[PDB]
Specification:
part of a larger assembly, 8 chains, A alpha+beta, B mainly alpha, C mainly beta, D alpha+beta, E mainly alpha, F alpha/beta, G alpha/beta, H little secondary structure, D: 4-stranded mixed sheet, 3 helices, 4 strands, binds ligand ZMP, binds iron/sulfur cluster, binds FE2/S2 (inorganic) cluster, binds potassium ion, electron transport, complex, respiration
Chain lengths: ~130, ~90, ~100, ~90, ~110, ~700, ~210, ~50
């Protein structure tokens, strides 16, 4: 046979070594990151990311540096699809929420529409 | 040779400029050359008409052409700075 | 151009000084608060404005490749000088 | 001690909410004319099962499932809520 | 859903392995208290073993408990062969760690963590 | 279908006629380089960066402007496309200043990035560059015009979206300068968005200037609360400190813009903040205390209250979690007197049906209307991106706009019918000439402003507007899926407070003034201590000390919208959630955490511990408040209109004047904007 | 493209393609993919039931003789349901060549240990146990090799944080080095560096 | 520097100091930035 049938939910939380505080009190956010509106390039909007809720950052009394106590504060994960991210968060016991991908809707462009005979879409200058 | 404006006491939006009434009749004759809904097409002659009455264009002739043609004043400033005949200095 | 707080503490060129009720002055007890007493904002004001005969001037900070990247400053405003964004030197068209 | 508000959750398109929809199109108005100072919050949503929430005095809330009712059954459940006030 | 097993074909073999690992830890606790010259009792060390076994007591997957038994055997080999120092044994007893706020109100008082 | 087949690098793609070369390349997942093309602006075609080879054609075409012909093979990676890109990038970088270290665009510069990706690696320009005089277009947008590459996104934005027509190009040739030609101050309600679309650092944010740098910032995706648009934003922080606020693209709300209050009111979020709990000492002065002492002194007064002894006013910036928290807390005392600052009329249907207080059409449905009627509102400042959507429909769909109110500037031309409310009785009778326009329009849209509902005849105005909407919809050519009746809200907390069943307006507290008053962020000054009895116990819970906090007895320092994960519902009923960007300063806490801890001190512990359990309660009160980015349609306009016919309230003779007539009144509305030094500079700049 | 561009080696590309076809057709039971990179490196991507038969082939076959195990490697790729990618770099001193043998596993499926083929693997896959949590069946002494003795967690998994979950300090009360939850006096500053523009159009993936 | 002198500047130290560690003149670190959040100062008049 050499194959067993495990009909249970996949759960590796006892094997990851993550302490309980950072399994059951964390909210994973699964999202495609928004395009930086300083720029027109879209190559950062191609993958799904997983991040966590930001915890407390405070001021170091000596230097004024940003002291943290959150180990997961920099943990950003990359996924090809939404279902891979959902499956990875369910496998690790993370409570998650998913934002759907926002695509830009197809616009209707026409250079001649800048010079219409009777429509408001004339450009006053060019 | 500057393409910005600074308000001097001889060139400001309170510099006295207005058309003579015969220049208003000429402006009406100019505006009737273009179709209705395209009154902005009379920016280039009328502004030059303001150069013929005055000799040069302060920023009161540009604003007057913008007022009587119902066009934004920036769109007259663009035409006045684009074209080399419009004297923006006396 | 250093001044002093009423606590007796030197205000830095940023403007940082601890409050009187701030406990973090205790780190300077028996020791010193190291400030630099050559304020760059007070030293770049001491430079003379360069009167040049051109409309666009170039600044590299001096020294050629030992300065900053070479930028071009327009001098069309006669109200205000044209200041280099790197070294802080300022220029005026002489007409 | 007494009823304070009523909350009626339902769907716009689900057939299990249909009688609840049949309640609000016909019998809500003379309900609201009968109870002008009673807030009856109608809340439509996308895929919910129908539900009647009855908040009473001092934070007590009873909870009636209006799923697959007719409009007569919604009328009877709501008038039982109005007549109970417990 | 047909997966390759690690050691156990089902959960009963898995519970057998959990049970033998618990027997080996239970026998090992007095020797661990003695040769690491700990400050705990043998009963307190066996309580910590029972606590660590009950911590994983909700797992229903045979492969996950096979890996838990494998990792427990590894920790046991690191304890018997004296590879751990005293500090690694005493890390199960979070003693210098101050007790965390457990209820809502004290977590409200100390900060922002839920 | 009429789809034509074209080819991008040999790959077939079916495109609509009129689709450009750039959009056809976008449909196969390839982004053509660009500087002047912007998909929300008009096509310019004047940077020439998008030049691409069509094969069997010996000339590159501008992909942003050229429509695809059937059978074209667009060669996005061929040799002469790359040579065109390198030549154009060389001419862009010829006169561009070496300012990348001192420029705020560095790291997030289009010119840098696609010079790295598409231009060469070195220079041939052996000449002296040009230098341009800088401009002063206002206190928001710093202007360094030597960095300008003359892509004219300035001018197209100010003309077509902002509707200003005061930017342009003067001069000719290489001396062509983008500017205003005069000392003019570009202060629109959307004036900071040119910082977004400027691909270079010619237009930067003056408050953000020099402080940070894009690679080190953390990007927290969050929601605007400055109005009831619910604009999706990115709060960019850096080491536990909010740096700036960018927009997120949401196609149905804020397309990719935000307003200037949204963009620049974040500096009020680090001034005048409530950081520690305060109680009154023996001298009657506020003094700092612990959370134990403050919550004990509030709960000891709350246990002595019952019924109408305790009431609560919700402010304009309160999330749905704290709203349902304080509602359940006062319902444990059996208090139903929970109010907002903003009056919505309870006459008739009230807040029972959702359809009579929502923007029922949508923000997106403005694109589908053909006649929009605006009553008693100045939507340019009450909801600036709702007005931007009306302007986009005005410009592209030839939308007919009418306004009943004072003749404000809306950045487009409308039909001003008058300011008296009796015109609402004339359109609802058919004697007015605009009534025939509403009859013959297929998709009419009647938007009542919620600021006009602050008048004492708000029920009469809402009845007249609902009578107009149901006179149209039940008779004229409306399908039935189309929504006509609409209310534009200006307050982020208001729609969530109405879904939870608050009593809008403070008339319930003016009826019987209580001996204990909660103020969740209430800073409108709607209820002062002259309205209360002799020793009312006022508890201010909020994040700024502006209005309600100097009169309070115990101050509960709360979280702001960047400091909590928090549900806000916009004017169309869409529920949205902020995320934690930074933590609240000092001893300040999340708002429902404060109310829940107060409930535990009082011995009336509310049945939730975590944020998810609060949202389960919030789903129990109305399940739309947890279905995020969803607009649940609200039916039953007919039943609300039948209930509105019961009590005939009389229209006042006062004309419909919105409270914000000029740009002066826009910049300071809530406690964050009033604490903002940038908004203070905006007001001082527009008042001079 | 002479001075600054790497010269392409077409002869090695053709030879490694021929040998990749050779191995793919001798062993079709386990070989899933065969690829040769542009810089001429052959990868045999196999099924994990053929770890021993493929590696025994390449070690012992007279046309392969990959007698040396250069390196044994895992890669965490969390978007795959078989997230761990086990990499066998092999060296044939007879034919002066290198091959790469790649397979996969998830957290729970054991990979067969290759100590019977290459004894060099005895520590390498032992490290793959310590760093990734991949169990290796029939390993002689499988245990941790790099982490501390009480270390929970498999660090080179990409969901493991950079600083860990614990940090040590000496405590003079208990006279002992203790482990506490990690608090950084300065947080590691995450830099989002990736450009929003496409860098390599030859690697463009087809969109959804 | 007797043959090739160093270039003189107005900010170069005329007095070179040696290693001051372990003395009262040693370096003590501090945050050179100012306060980030401003607190609300309540009014000093009573509220009646
Ligand atoms: C001195 C300090 C030393 C500390 C020792 C640390 C040892 C750590 C080893 C951890 C190994 C495990 O916990 S594996 C256990 C997981 N087992 C399961 O999930 C299956 C369920 N098992 C059980 O319920 C077990 O109680 C039994 C005994 C197998 C069956 O009980 P149920 O019947 O009622
Ligand atoms: S606009 Fe871009 S390329 Fe120009 S100086 Fe700024 S960062 Fe550099
Ligand atoms: S300032 Fe910026 S947006 Fe305006 S034309 Fe110049 S490069 Fe374009
Ligand atoms: S992007 Fe097409 S030319 Fe500017
Ligand atoms: K910019
Ligand atoms: Zn310089």
């Amino acid at each position: 046979t050499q194959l067993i049938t495990v009909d249970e939910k996949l759960d590796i939380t006892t094997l990851t070594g993550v302490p309980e505080e950072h399994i059951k009190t964390r909210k994973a956010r699964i999202f495609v990151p928004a395009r930086n509106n300083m720029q027109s390039g879209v190559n950062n909007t191609k993958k799904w990311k997983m991040e966590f809720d930001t915890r407390e950052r405070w001021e170091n009394p000596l230097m004024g540096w940003a002291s943290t106590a959150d180990p997961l504060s920099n943990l950003v994960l990359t996924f090809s699809t939404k279902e891979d991210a959902i499956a990875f968060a369910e496998k690790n016991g993370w409570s998650y929420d998913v934002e759907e991908r926002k695509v830009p809707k197809p616009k209707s462009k026409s250079y001649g529409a800048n010079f219409s005979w009777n429509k408001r879409t004339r450009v006053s200058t060019k | 040779a500057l393409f910005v404006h600074r308000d001097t006491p001889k060139n400001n939006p309170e510099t006295p400029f207005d058309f003579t009434p015969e220049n208003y009749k000429r402006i009406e004759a100019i505006v009737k050359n273009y179709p209705e809904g395209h009154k902005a097409a009379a920016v280039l002659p009328v502004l030059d008409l303001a150069q013929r009455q005055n000799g040069w264009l302060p920023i009161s002739a540009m604003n007057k052409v913008a007022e009587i043609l119902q066009v934004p004043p920036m769109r007259v400033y663009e035409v006045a700075t684009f074209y080399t005949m419009y004297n923006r200095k006396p | 151009g250093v001044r002093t707080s009423p606590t007796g503490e030197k205000v830095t060129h940023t403007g940082q000084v601890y409050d009187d009720e701030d406990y973090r002055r205790v780190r300077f007890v028996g020791r010193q608060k190291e400030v630099n007493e050559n304020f760059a904002i007070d030293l770049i004001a001491e430079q003379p404005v360069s009167q040049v005969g051109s409309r666009v001037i170039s600044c590299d900070g001096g020294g050629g490749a030992l300065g900053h990247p070479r930028v071009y400053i327009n001098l069309d405003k006669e109200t205000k000088t044209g200041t280099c964004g790197y070294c802080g030197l300022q220029f005026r068209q002489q007409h | 001690l007494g009823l304070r508000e009523i909350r009626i959750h339902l769907c716009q398109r689900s057939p299990g909410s249909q009688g609840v929809r049949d309640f609000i199109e016909k019998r809500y108005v003379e309900l609201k004319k009968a109870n002008p100072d009673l807030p009856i919050l109608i809340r439509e949503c996308s895929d919910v099962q129908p539900k009647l929430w009855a908040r009473y005095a001092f934070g007590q809330e009873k909870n009636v499932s209006l799923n697959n009712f007719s409009a007569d059954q919604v009328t009877r459940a709501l008038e039982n809520v109005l007549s109970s006030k417990a | 859903t047909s997966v390759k097993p690690i050691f156990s074909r089902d959960m009963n073999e898995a519970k057998r392995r959990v049970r033998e690992l618990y027997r080996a830890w239970y026998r090992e606790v007095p020797n661990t208290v003695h040769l690491f010259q700990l400050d705990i009792s043998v009963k307190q060390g066996r309580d910590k073993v029972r606590e660590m076994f009950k911590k994983n007591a909700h797992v229903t997957d045979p492969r996950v408990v096979d890996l838990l038994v494998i990792k427990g055997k590894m920790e046991l080999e690191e304890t018997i062969n004296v590879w751990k120092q005293r500090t690694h044994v005493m890390r199960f007893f979070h003693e210098t760690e101050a007790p965390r706020p457990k209820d809502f109100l004290s977590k409200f008082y100390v900060g922002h963590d839920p | 279908s009429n789809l034509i087949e074209v080819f991008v690098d040999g790959q077939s793609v079916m495109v609509e006629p009129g689709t450009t070369v750039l959009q056809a390349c976008e449909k196969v997942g390839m982004q053509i380089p660009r500087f002047c093309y912007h998909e929300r602006l008009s096509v310019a075609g004047n940077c020439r960066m998008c030049l691409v080879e069509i094969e069997k054609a010996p000339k590159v075409v501008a992909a942003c402007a050229m429509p695809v012909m059937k059978g074209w093979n667009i060669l996005t990676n061929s040799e002469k496309t790359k040579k065109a890109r390198e030549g154009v990038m060389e001419f862009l970088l010829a006169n561009h200043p070496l300012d990348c270290p001192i420029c705020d665009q560095g790291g997030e510069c289009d010119l840098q990035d696609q010079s790295m990706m598409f231009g060469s690696d070195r220079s041939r320009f052996l000449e002296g560059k040009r230098a341009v005089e800088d401009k002063n277009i206002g206190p928001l947008v710093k202007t360094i015009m030597t960095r300008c590459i003359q892509c004219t996104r300035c001018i197209r934005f100010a003309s077509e979206i902002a509707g200003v027509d005061d930017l342009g190009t003067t001069g000719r040739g290489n001396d062509m300068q983008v500017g205003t030609y005069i000392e003019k101050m570009f202060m629109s309600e959307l004036s900071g968005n040119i910082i977004d679309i400027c691909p270079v650092g010619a237009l930067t944010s003056k408050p953000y200037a020099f402080t940070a740098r894009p690679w080190e910032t953390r990007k927290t995706e969050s929601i605007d609360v400055m109005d009831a648009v619910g604009s999706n934003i990115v709060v960019s922080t850096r080491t536990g400190e909010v740096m700036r606020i960018l927009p997120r693209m949401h196609e149905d709300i804020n397309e990719e813009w935000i307003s200037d209050k949204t963009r620049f009111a974040y500096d009020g979020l680090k001034r005048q903040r409530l950081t520690e709990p305060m109680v009154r000492n023996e001298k009657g002065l506020l003094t700092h205390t612990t959370w134990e002492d403050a919550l004990s002194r509030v709960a000891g007064m709350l246990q002595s209250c019952q019924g109408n002894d305790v009431a609560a006013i919700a402010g304009g910036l309160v999330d749905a979690e704290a709203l349902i928290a304080l509602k359940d807390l006062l319902n444990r005392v059996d208090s139903d007197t929970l109010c907002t600052e903003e009056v919505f009329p309870t006459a008739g249907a009230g807040t029972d049906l959702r359809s009579n207080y929502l923007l029922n059409t949508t923000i997106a449905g403005v694109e589908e209307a053909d006649v929009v009627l605006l009553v008693g509102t100045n939507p340019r400042f009450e909801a600036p991106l709702f007005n931007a959507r009306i302007r986009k429909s005005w410009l592209h769909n030839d939308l007919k706009v009418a306004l009943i109110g004072s003749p404000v500037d809306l950045t487009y031309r409308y039909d001003h019918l008058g300011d008296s409310p009796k015109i609402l009785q004339d359109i609802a009778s058919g004697s007015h000439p605009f009534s025939q326009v509403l009859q013959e329009a297929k998709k009419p849209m009647v938007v009542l402003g919620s600021s006009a509902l602050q008048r004492n005849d708000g029920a009469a105005i809402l009845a007249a507007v609902s009578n107009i909407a149901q006179k149209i919809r039940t008779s004229s050519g409306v399908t039935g899926d189309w929504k006509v009746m609409n209310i534009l809200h200006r307050i982020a907390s208001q729609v969530a407070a109405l879904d939870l069943g608050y009593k809008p307006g403070v008339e319930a507290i003016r009826k019987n003034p209580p001996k204990m008053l909660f103020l969740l962020g209430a800073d409108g000054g709607c209820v002062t201590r002259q309205d209360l009895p002799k020793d009312c116990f006022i508890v201010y819970q909020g994040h700024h000390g502006d209005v309600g906090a100097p009169i309070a007895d115990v101050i509960l320092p709360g979280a702001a919208y960047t400091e909590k994960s928090a549900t806000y519902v916009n004017t169309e009923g869409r529920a949205q959630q902020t995320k934690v960007a930074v933590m609240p300063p000092g001893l300040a806490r999340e708002d429902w955490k404060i109310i829940r801890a107060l409930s535990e001190i009082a011995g009336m512990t509310l049945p939730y511990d975590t944020l998810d359990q609060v949202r389960n309660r919030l789903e129990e009160v109305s399940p739309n408040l947890v279905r995020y980015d969803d607009v649940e349609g609200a039916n039953y306009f007919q039943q609300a209109s039948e209930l509105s016919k019961l009590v005939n309230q009389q229209l006042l003779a006062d004309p419909l004047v919105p409270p914000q007539l000029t740009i002066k009144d826009f910049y300071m509305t809530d406690s964050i904007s009033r604490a903002s030094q940038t908004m203070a500079k905006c007001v001082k700049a527009v008042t001079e | 493209t002479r001075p600054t561009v790497r010269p392409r080696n077409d002869v090695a590309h053709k030879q490694l393609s021929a040998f990749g076809e050779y191995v793919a057709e001798i062993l079709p039971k386990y070989v899933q993919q065969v690829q040769v990179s542009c810089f001429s490196e052959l990868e045999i991507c196999i099924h994990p039931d053929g770890v021993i038969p493929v590696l025994t082939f390449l070690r012992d076959h007279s046309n392969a003789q990959f007698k040396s195990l250069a390196d044994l490697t895992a890669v965490d790729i969390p978007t795959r349901q078989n997230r761990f990618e086990i990499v066998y770099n092999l060296l044939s001193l007879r034919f002066n060549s290198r091959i790469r043998v790649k397979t996969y596993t998830d957290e729970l499926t054991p990979v067969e240990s290759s100590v019977s083929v290459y004894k060099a693997a005895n520590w390498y896959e032992r490290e793959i146990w310590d760093m990734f949590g991949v169990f290796f069946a029939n390993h002689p002494d499988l245990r941790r090799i790099l982490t501390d003795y009480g270390f929970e967690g498999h660090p080179f998994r990409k969901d493991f944080p950079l600083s860990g979950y614990v940090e040590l300090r000496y405590d003079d009360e208990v006279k002992r080095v203790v482990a506490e939850p990690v608090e950084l006096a300065q947080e590691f500053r995450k830099f989002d560096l990736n450009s929003p523009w496409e860098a390599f159009p030859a690697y463009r993936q087809p969109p959804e | 520097p007797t043959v090739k002198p160093p270039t003189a500047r107005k900010f170069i130290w005329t007095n070179h100091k040696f290693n001051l560690s372990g003395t009262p003149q040693q370096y003590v670190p501090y945050s050179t930035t100012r306060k980030k959040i401003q607190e609300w100062v309540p009014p000093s008049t009573p509220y009646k």
